[PDB]
Predict the structure of beta-mannanase.
Amino acid sequence: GFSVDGNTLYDANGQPFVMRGINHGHAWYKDTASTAIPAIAEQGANTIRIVLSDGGQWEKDDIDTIREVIELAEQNKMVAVVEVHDATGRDSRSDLNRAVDYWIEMKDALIGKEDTVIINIANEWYGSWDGSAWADGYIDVIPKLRDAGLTHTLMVDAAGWGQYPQSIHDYGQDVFNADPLKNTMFSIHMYEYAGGDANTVRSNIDRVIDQDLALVIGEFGHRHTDVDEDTILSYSEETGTGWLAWSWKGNSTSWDYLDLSEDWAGQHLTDWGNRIVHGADGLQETSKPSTVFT
Ligand SMILES: OC[C@H]1O[C@@H](O[C@H]2[C@H](O)[C@H](O)[C@H](O[C@H]3[C@H](O)[C@H](O)[C@@H](O)O[C@@H]3CO)O[C@@H]2CO)[C@@H](O)[C@@H](O)[C@@H]1O
């Protein structure tokens, strides 16, 4: 399937793949799948990041639901970055363990799909700014996922709710080395801390890619009440760094400035959605499908 060599992610045809896509809050709106996933593909996204629940905080996504969402993605010519969200911001190892068990439990939905699915082990596990503690978690669990027969590229979110990318700079190679398949990439979520201005965006990207580690900005936003989405897009394009905007629809009121679409079908994008789809360095301009799809 997918493979990582230095700071590049390669598709199953060996062609570099640069993620340009959208997060979708599937776990909380499970019945929107057949509308939302194809609508995201219609915007030119080459990758969808699909929010799943392991039952820790929300309604567990069962094996049939996983199969359903994956299939909707690959049959609309998107790679599926699957992620478990129930450990968000938690420092406790038990929350990471729960996500790891979930992947193992659900392995029969994932095995064989390594050319179209990438596994983001847990959304924003380890909220505190502590690179060592963060690393120790992944060093312990990545070999267990490999032992279970999962050969997918794995995606690991930075510490600090994704906003402490120093963790990846300092310890990301140690994490990568713990993977016996050497097929692990990293993600930063850029909001007001990690994406607060142009210098910060570029330095945070540089501090990973200059360790010869592969990188996606697996979530990012825009200025609210800031966040430099223009530099995230432009510098990502310059450096071949992947990105995934947050999110299609359904944020709670406090975060609803983050909805990219007014409707589930994507007929009415928000200003934010239009920026991501139709603006400079956005999906229409820069998103290329994985060559597994043609
Ligand atoms: O509570 C009933 C209502 O829930 C809706 O799903 C919510 C989830 O339970 C979470 O609370 C979810 O939280 C996310 C926020 O919306 C922001 O996206 C974000 O940054 O992160 C958090 C989680 O980390 O929000 C949704 C929506 O409010 C939904 O399932 C609905 O059907 C139901 O009636």
